[PDB]
Ligand binder design. Sequence first.
Ligand SMILES: CCOCn1oc(=O)c(-c2ccc(F)cc2)c1-c1ccnc(Oc2ccccc2O)n1
Length: 341
Amino acid sequence: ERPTFYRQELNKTIWEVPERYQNLSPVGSGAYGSVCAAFDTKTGHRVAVKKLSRPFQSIIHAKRTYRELRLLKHMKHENVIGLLDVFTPARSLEEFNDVYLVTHLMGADLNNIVKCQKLTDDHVQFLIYQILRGLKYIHSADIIHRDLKPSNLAVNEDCELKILDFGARHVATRWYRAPEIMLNWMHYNQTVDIWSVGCIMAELLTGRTLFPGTDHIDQLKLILRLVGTPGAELLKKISSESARNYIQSLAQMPKMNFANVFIGANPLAVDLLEKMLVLDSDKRITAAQALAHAYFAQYHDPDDEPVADPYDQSFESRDLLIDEWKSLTYDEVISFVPPPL
Ligand SMILES: CCOCn1oc(=O)c(-c2ccc(F)cc2)c1-c1ccnc(Oc2ccccc2O)n1
């Protein structure tokens, strides 16, 4: 089989999709793409359709299309965005130049669902548990999110949450960023995603952004004032002289009393936060560890927290030319096989 398409301009952009999907309605766009809500007539479902902006405009563009198609094809978890479909109108490699991605429309992000804010301990518990559950899977594939933030979480009105790996507004990235990755570090880790999860949690229990820096310099100042200036041990792990100084040069920040800052809320929540917002990535709790913690007693089930199949990202090392990335991508478009009902 090979479907028939129809073009239209969802302002000011042109869309070329199988007749399968109807009622294409714009829902947002960034620099790397445009999404539309729509109805999958096959399954009778509502879906999100993403048209990538110019997938192969450059080497940098080429490899990221590829990166995106590859991760999305790999992700099969209820807490992580995956692919229902992927298509192109082209009929040969020769004319390949557009890529479309299909997934379950969620219709909003955490932000979009949460404001004005401060929800019951109960919803926080549930939202964060879904995030730690999807993160468990992703990390288990040897993948680091690194861009975890509210606008990177897709939530529907049933409060079900999915992590999207690529996807801002319509959040301010450095507000959610592990300190280590605002210092040029490192041979750092997975637990940078744990920092952000802590940052999101704080704001949900609190109704306000934990660390709304104005820049990377400010950002660190606010982080330090909560968590305090670094132990001499941590210090010794820092090779970056300039990093050491910036730190070593501050008010000697005392570690603040979580209890007092946070907030009148569930002492379990706070003791978990305590464990997520650590200066040392080496000492930060892990997705899986975080899931087995008292705070999520009513949601936590160890035999329903799957981990992923291994993912080859050896491609990340390579340096190919646009055409090779492009044909790589196409090959993956060609080979895609759809999910089961
Ligand atoms: C436009 C804001 O976010 C878009 N988001 O980034 C993406 O990149 C995709 C995306 C779409 C298709 C795909 F195959 C993969 C990702 C979606 C996406 C995925 C699923 N549902 C929705 O619905 C939303 C609508 C408005 C606001 C937030 C939403 O979550 N978006």
